[PDB]
Structure 1
Amino acid sequence: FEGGQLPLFRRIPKRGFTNINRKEFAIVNLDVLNRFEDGTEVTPELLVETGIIRNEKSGIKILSNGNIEKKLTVKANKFSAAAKEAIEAAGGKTEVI
């Protein structure tokens, strides 16, 4: 309350809407995939057991933050172009599920 001066929130307009079908993904930056031992294929359920993601909202997306070292065969629901260009760069196969 501003003692009768129109409150800030009423001076400025409402914006946008909420998408009913919004999809938020669980993020897994590369640096945390170094936790796995070379040759291993990395599925969602494996990322649960290791405790890197606890809840898998919509699905698992892989992003390119840091850098990877181990030739993994990663499979996640989505991939950053950069993440896909960095897993292969090392010598691994990305497949989408």
Structure 2
Amino acid sequence: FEGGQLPLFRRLPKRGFTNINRKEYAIVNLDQLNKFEDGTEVTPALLV
């Protein structure tokens, strides 16, 4: 509150809107796979 002078968040303008469906993929990098073996599968039941 700058004392009557309007604050910093009145001069700057607003822009954007978020979404209603902003599907957030759990971003697993490729480096993390260098720990296991047999090469069978990677799986949303196993990679958890």
| 1:11-90 equivalence runs, <5 A | 11-48=11-48
List, as ranges, runs of 4+ consecutive aligned residues in structure 1 with deviation greater than 2 Å: none
Unaligned 5+ residue runs, structure 1? Answer: 49-97
State the TM-score, normalized to the length of structure 1.
0.46
- Per-residue CA deviations over 1:29-76 (Å, capped at 9, x if unaligned) read 11101122142210111111xxxxxxxxxxxxxxxxxxxxxxxxxxxx
Greater RCO (Cα-Cα under 8 Å, separation 6 or more): 1
| 2:7 aligned with 1:7 | yes
State the TM-score, normalized to the length of structure 2.
0.85
33-42 or 11-20, which deviates more: 33-42
Higher strand share: 1
What RMSD in Å do the two structures reach over aligned CA positions? 1.1
SS at match of 2:45: helix
Tell me which amino acid in the other structure corresponds to 1:5. Answer: Q
Identity %: 90
Tell me which amino acid in the other structure corresponds to 2:44. Answer: P
Count of residue pairs the alignment pairs up: 48
